[PDB]
Amino acid sequence: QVAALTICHQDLETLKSFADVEGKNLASLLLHCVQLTDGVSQIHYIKQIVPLLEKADKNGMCDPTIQSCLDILAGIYLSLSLKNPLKKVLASSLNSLPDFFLPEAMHRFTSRLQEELNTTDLYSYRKVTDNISSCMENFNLGRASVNNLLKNVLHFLQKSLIEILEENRKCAGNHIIQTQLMNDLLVGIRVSMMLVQKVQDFQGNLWKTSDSPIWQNMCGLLSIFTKVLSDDDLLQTVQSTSGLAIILFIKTMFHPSEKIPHLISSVLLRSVDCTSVPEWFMSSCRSLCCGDISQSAVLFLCQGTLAMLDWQNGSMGRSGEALLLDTAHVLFTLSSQIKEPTLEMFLSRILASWTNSAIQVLESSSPSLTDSLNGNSSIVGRLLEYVYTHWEHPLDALRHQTKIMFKNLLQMHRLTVEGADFVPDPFFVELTESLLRLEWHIKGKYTCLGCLVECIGVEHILAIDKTIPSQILEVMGDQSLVPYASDLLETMFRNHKSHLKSQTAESSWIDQWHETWVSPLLFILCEGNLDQKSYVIDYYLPKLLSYSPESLQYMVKILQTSIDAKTGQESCNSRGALGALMACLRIARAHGHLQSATDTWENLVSDARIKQGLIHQHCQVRIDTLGLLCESNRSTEIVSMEEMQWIQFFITYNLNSQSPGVRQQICSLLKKLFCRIQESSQVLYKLEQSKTKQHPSVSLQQYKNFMSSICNSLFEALFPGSSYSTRFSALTILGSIAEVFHVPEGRIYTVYQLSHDIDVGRFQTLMECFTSTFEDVKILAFDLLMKLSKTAVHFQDSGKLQGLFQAALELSTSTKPYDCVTASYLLNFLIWQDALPSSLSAYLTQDRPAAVVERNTLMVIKCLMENLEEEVSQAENSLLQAAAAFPMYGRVHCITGALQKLSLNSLQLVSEWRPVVEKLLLMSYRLSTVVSPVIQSSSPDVTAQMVLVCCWRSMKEVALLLGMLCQLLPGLLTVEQVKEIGDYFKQHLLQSRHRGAFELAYTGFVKLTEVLNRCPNVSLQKLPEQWLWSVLEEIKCSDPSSKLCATRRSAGIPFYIQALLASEPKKGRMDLLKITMKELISLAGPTDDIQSTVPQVHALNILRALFRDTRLGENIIPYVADGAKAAILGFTSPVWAVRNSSTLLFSALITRIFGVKRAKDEHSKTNRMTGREFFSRFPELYPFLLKQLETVANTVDSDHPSMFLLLLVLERLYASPMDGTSSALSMGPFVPFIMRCGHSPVYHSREMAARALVPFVMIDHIPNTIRTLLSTLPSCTDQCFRQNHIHGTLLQVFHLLQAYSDSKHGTNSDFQHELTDITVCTKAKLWLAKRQNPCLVTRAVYIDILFLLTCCLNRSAESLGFWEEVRGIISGSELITGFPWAFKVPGLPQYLQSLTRLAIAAVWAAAAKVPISFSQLLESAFPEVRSLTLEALLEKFLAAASGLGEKGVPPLLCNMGEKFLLLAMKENHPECFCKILKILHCMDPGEWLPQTEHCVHLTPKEFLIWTMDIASNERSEIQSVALRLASKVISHHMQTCVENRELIAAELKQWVQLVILSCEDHLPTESRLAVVEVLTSTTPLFLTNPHPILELQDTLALWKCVLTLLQSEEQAVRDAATETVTTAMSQENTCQSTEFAFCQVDASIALALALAVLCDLLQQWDQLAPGLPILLGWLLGESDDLEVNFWAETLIFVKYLCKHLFCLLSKSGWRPPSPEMLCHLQRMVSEQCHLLSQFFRELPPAAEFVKTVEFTRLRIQEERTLACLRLLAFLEGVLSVWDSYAESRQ
Amino acid sequence: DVYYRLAKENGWRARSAFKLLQLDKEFQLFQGVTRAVDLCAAPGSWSQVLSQKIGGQGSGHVVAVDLQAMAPLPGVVQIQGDITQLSTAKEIIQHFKGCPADLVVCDGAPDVTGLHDVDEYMQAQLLLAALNIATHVLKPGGCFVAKIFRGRDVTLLYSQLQVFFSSVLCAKPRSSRNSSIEAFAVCQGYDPPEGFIPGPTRIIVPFVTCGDLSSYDSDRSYPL
Ligand SMILES: Nc1ncnc2c1ncn2[C@@H]1O[C@H](CSCC[C@H](N)C(=O)O)[C@@H](O)[C@H]1O
Ligand SMILES: [Mg+2]
Ligand SMILES: [Zn+2]
């Protein structure tokens, strides 16, 4: 879009006085140009302007016609805004004027500019400044003009700036006007800087005399700049630009140039002597001298110093270097004082600029500066401290600037040590080693290592540790670390390739490169876990393939081999090879690399491989194969026939994907495919009309057929009862088709049009998608219907549309809470296609389609309003029937939904829209008054629950409607109405007293408040601040008798405050926040008054919300510390409420400070920050915390303390591993107090102190700390024993030892000596574990320490003495003796567990080379001793038997079958019984089943009966374990002898019934997992047996279990069932039923494959005759015969079963012999058809919308019965019932 | 989940009702209970379950108490007040002179913040108050069910609870969110200390109020 050129009216005659009818002169061209509208031919004539002037280079004196022509050109140019490209157009044109005409144009354009400069309108100043700006850039016409008018332009700039400042200070209160004025100031300052920089007049002195007008204007400008810099109520951009300008002018205006660096230096140091500066400087820059300038002023001045001075070439010399160092010093001083967020961002930018300037200076500097700027200097140390403190700042700009600073620091050091011999500098090596000590979750580690890699080369980092690539790849399974790891790895291998192609110049280097970077990648791709695979494919693999595409050939050859060897074995590496190959090929094709070969290759992909990938079990493989087919580098490449067939195959099965991400990726790739079809069809058409390949008309026909069949599939996927994912996918892909093929409607040819394929019935189904319970489906259907052409009344007659309108009106008043959504969508559809009935024209009094949709909206809204008014009146009469018959919220919802679609800002019938809005507000208030008393209070054939539903839904709808109406930009909304709306929101949301109307009103109020901010009326935009003040002074004198409630976290007051604070412009000014936080922090402070509790309570309730709101975000940081103090000081208050509020606020503060949790469980170090970062961000907490800690420590000895919160904070701070300098704030002082906190008489405090002490101790100091901590324990003969002190000391040493063990485990070899010292110290005080110690808690902790020591000693190989001491501990324990007194002594179970762990450790130690034996541990009377022993035995057996690992049971557990067999019958503790059964399952039945006869007096058969009885009765994990055991026993019986099949028959039937039982619900997921595992293990025996052992009913029952679990709602069961299906299809007699043998497949196709295998077996067993009745009974669904499921569709099973039955009967021609067997089926099916006709008859009109659930279930049953009729009719060729039902229905 | 629906579909005031029922069929809480106390029932779903399973006989007496107000039920007496306050404890115990309650349930929880240590602290306070009420009311061998927050360290709570009860079990029903760390301690067989009144008490009561071991401390070397 362009703006039409305009001209001055009185110029017309002026240009008419020189025009000519013939049109020879330029004047006629001007006439032709000005009288136009298109801004395109004007441009052409503008070019031809130049030749017209060129063709008159003979006169020698400018023609007056040409004079007036150029004058009018100048006037037009100066009247053109900068948004118009024509302005630059004629600028460029006049740039090429002939040299003869220059002087007159100069003079006259000068005159025009001069008279422009004399304007005095304040708001016209911006245009003049923009004109001056334009005359500078590449416009030779204006450059000379302004060069001739320096005095005038400078005077204009000065006066304009002064006047704008005055107006801004006068227009206080309105912030839009102020914003415009600030922008004008900014453009003025920038233009002034441009002028000074870019005018060839300021060079030389030539004007520095005091009398020069230029000099005086410059001094005035400098004074204005200083005044605006020192100001603080302006935008910070203005002040920063002012500082730049100040430095530029000082540099320009100062005659003794060599003294400029010194003078500026003093100005920065605030040490300027007022008696030595020149007089003009003192006059203009009085603020700069004589002190007292803000910190922002100094910040911006040093910014300007760095930016606007010549640092290169050493022009400023030694004084320049001194200025550089002084600026660094000033910046570092400011860094510690600045706390405003925006000022911190500015300081980061300025520090990065300082590094740039240091680079430039250092390139030619003096040797003295080298010493002061090298990497070991103090300045660089401070810079590194800044970087380490700030790389993880919340603000993104901060972090980016820190990255720049770090890179520049390394460059500075390189420049300083250019006298280098060998590449690896000691500084770089030390930095690298220090960085490599950080954890891999530290995000700054990656960027810093990348910079270092580019500095010193990756070969040295690899030499330090050559497993780094693998370590980086192992974190790639965690998203939000993937980008950093990917970038680091990319930097690494780019550098490595550049290094290998160095001196060693051959071709073999690539091999090494491959084995460094590709082989680990292949291993991850084939065998990594799922998340790791997805993230590596999405983020890392494209980078590697793009950088080195010739590596693709290497990868494929490796993967293809691993594929083929798979067929040799009929391994995981051979199993993941297909997915990796598909990922590599998809990436290669999408980037156009060597794989761009016309159906994806000649031989890389085969039909079998592609079909296997497209249907694979892993979502990633399916997506990668689909992407290989769908997306290509060339956007118009032909889609081959093979790709079309594969895509149809894919669509058949992949419409029910459950992951929303997977579904979205599928839809996007399909859209890409449709775009390719559309774009290549145009190429085909072009070739066709252009009268190897296949005659493009053939390909066009193929495209048409393909698109038609795809649409057929998509519309088939909309069957009744279809899942949410399948409707979502179908509607998404249909909408994508409608959008993609809607392109060439302005064109001539289109290969496909969706509208042609839309029948009446397909339109009916699309509208019926409005009844889905999910709003996403409603939205997608609405969008698709709107995208179609000729749809409104083409597909619908008037009567049926009237029925639809009646249906929507009826849904708007239904008691079901979500029918109103359907009614709203239906009504919007009728409105936006002009399908409303004609009677609705009777509501209003009387092409622009906006006008007709507005009229329709008005009519429907008026109808709804009439109904609503009547219903509200009757509700006022009596609310019972209103809740029962006509709840009023449906109409309100429909009205709001109708309004939501309009553009409220651009209505056109305001005369009609005003009274309707008035009535709407009145009825909203009436309804709210009716239903609110029921919602604050309790209740006043209609239950109270539905009354409450009506009431709160009405509340919500009214709030949303008011929030909608607030967007009319108050006009249709008067100021009184807005005030009343705000009052309504305030009356609620502060008096609700209930959860309702807290979050209900908040959304509407937020909408109103944002609108109120953006409003230009001044009287309205002052409302939020006034409301904030009102509520604050309400808070102070709360008077607990008020309506405000303390429960529900507060009386909605936090929501009110949040909404008011939301009005503040984003990052704009945030002045309400400062006031609110000052007042709330003051209120929450300690109060002498007892009555002052409630104001202190609400504050902590409000503050909490303010500290977690996302909008306040980084603006709330400067208050955190204060808030923290409050919380902590509020934890010691005697009142309970203050402490509870303090706890909640402290939780919010912890989340705000340390961030959201990064992983579910471990929280190793993911939410901790170093002491340096924490105490740099909140430096006022270091004294406070320390002081507070000391206090509580001194309370411990001399006795609700706040020890808990202090320790909880302190536990999340650790010491920085790469602490280049010693800890400046030195967390060390905390250690003595933390230790003393361990002597608290509260268990939790002792535990917390033990946990918090760990981060504050260096690892190398842990041994000495442990020794000195142990030395404080009392010896056995001492006389002072304090149990709390001993327990705390023991907890501390236990946690310290645990931390010590988890490091220095294999890294060191010297810790053996330290461990020897530790164990000597522990042996010195072993007495606390024996029976002399009376309390069991202390014994337990000491025994835990001993056990940890045993674990350490075992893996680290004196020890003999330790072991005999441990044996002495165990032998004398109550584990052998027993507990004498029958009193529940504290700590007993914990003590028993500790003893048991130590005893088991002793037993293993003795065996591997005895105080107690496994045999007599298992006989102890304490269930927990038995449980621990059984757990140890179970893990041994599992690791030795199930997960063999080339191992066997240890020799000590060889003959335990009898023992466990006896225990199983003896045990009564369920938790141990389950473990006993698991152990029995783990052993070979051939070794313990024979012994069953005499050990427990049971034959194997009756033992099996016993196990099945257990499995039938229990309903916990023991059920699944018992089922597994019974199945194992049965399998053994069958596999040993052939005589068992006849003596286990009844047991086999009972087992089948048990499996069926365990398949059902009310059982844990483990039961169904166990069923699937059992069936998988016994497929070749009970499922695909060539000669079945069970009866046919039992075999089919097992198959039915498999099929019903394969449709389970939960993913693990489905995956396991697919594994069962793979086993079933992979058997010897079933390898031909399908083509996916030995393939793992998704559940969707697994259902079909299982049915295929079952039918093939039924034929193979030759037992089809009694089989068909059962399968047809499955088809009928005997369950009904008359919570939503996100995966299972009934009709999918019906369709697959019917299709395979047809295929079986066709290939067999089975022809049932006896009709009597099927006669029963015909009887029941005919009865069902009769009932279905009866039910469909008595169903009200438009039942698809009024009776959706009944209609849907009837339709599903009808589809079942029709499928069964189709099969029966095929078999009998009773089609009479078929015909009668077809006539009754159709 | 599914129980949020089933709470609205059925006559249950909240989903939490299904947590109580699923704890019967696995522990047989309602064996012979006649009078029961309900602590911290926000809408009253647990009170409703108890009334329908005990008060269905007719003589069942149920006392419910909460910090907020509740809609009254037939056969249940409601009390509004902080069970931490001594006055509320006294007025609760006022209902049980003579015949003691056979069952005491506590569903309370603080405003769960998300980080689990503070939740354990606050829940420990609430459980101490609930345990005080229990020991002051229910008959020996009785039942005490209490919501707990299973975090990293739960040994102390189990140790303290084991002292007063024969059996203590930790259960997570199906209705409890799998992401949530809540659980239920079911305490079977109220077995109060012999010398305990609402010797042994000097060691138990300090340890139950807090992990106070300042009863085994001595001013002379321990006897052998
Ligand atoms: N100190 C205290 N005194 C009394 N009730 C408390 C309390 N702290 C928390 N609560 C109560 O604990 C409950 C948290 S959820 C309660 C759920 C309820 N039992 C049900 O059947 O669904 C709320 O009722 C809250 O009021
Ligand atoms: Mg509500
Ligand atoms: Zn002075």
Numbering used by the authors:
A (entry chain A): 10 to 579, 587 to 707, 717 to 871, 879 to 972, 1043 to 1072, 1082 to 1310, 1317 to 1474, 1482 to 1533, ...
B (entry chain B): 10 to 207, 227 to 252
Give passages from the manuscript.
FTSJ1, a protein conserved among most eukaryotes, mediates 2’-O-methylations at position 32 (Nm32) or position 34 (Nm34), complexed with THADA or WDR6, respectively. FTSJ1 is a bifunctional protein that forms a complex with THADA (also called Trm732 in yeast) or WDR6 (also called Trm734 in yeast) to mediate Nm32 or Nm34 formation, respectively. Herein, using cryo-electron microscopy, we solve the high-resolution structure of FTSJ1-THADA with or without a tRNA substrate.
Thereafter, we incubated FTSJ1-THADA with human tRNAPhe transcripts and S-adenosyl homocysteine (SAH), followed by cryo-EM analysis. THADA forms a hollow cylindrical structure with FTSJ1 bound to the top, which completely fits the closed form of FTSJ1-THADA. Notably, the substrate tRNAPhe was located inside THADA, anchoring the anticodon loop to the methyltransferase center of FTSJ1. The interior of THADA and the tRNA binding site of FTSJ1 are strongly positively charged, facilitating the binding of the substrate tRNAPhe. The tRNA-bound FTSJ1-THADA was exclusively observed in the closed form, suggesting that THADA was stabilized in this state after tRNA binding. SAH bound to the active site of FTSJ1 via hydrogen bonds with four residues (Ser25, Ser54, Asp75, and Asp91) and several hydrophobic interactions. Moreover, the 2′-OH group of C32, the methylation target of FTSJ1-THADA, is located 3.3 Å from the sulfur atom of SAH. The THADA-binding site of FTSJ1 (Cys238-Tyr250) interacted with α62 helix and the loop between α62 and α63 of THADA, forming several hydrogen bonds, including Cys238-Pro1358, Gly239-Arg1363, Asp240-Asn1401, Ser249-Cys1393, Tyr250-Gln1400, and Tyr250-Gln1449, alongside a π–π stacking interaction of Tyr250-Phe1398. Compared to the structure of tRNA located at the P-site of the ribosome, the tRNA bound to FTSJ1-THADA exhibited a shift in the anticodon loop of approximately 10 Å. This shift, resulting from the interactions between FTSJ1-THADA and the substrate tRNAPhe, places C32 of the tRNA near the methyltransferase center of FTSJ1 and SAH. Notably, Glu1225 mutation caused a modest decrease in the methyltransferase activity of FTSJ1-THADA (lane 8), whereas other mutations in Gln680, Thr798, and Tyr843 in THADA cylindrical core and Arg199 in N-terminal tail-like domain almost completely abolished methyltransferase activity (lane 4-7).
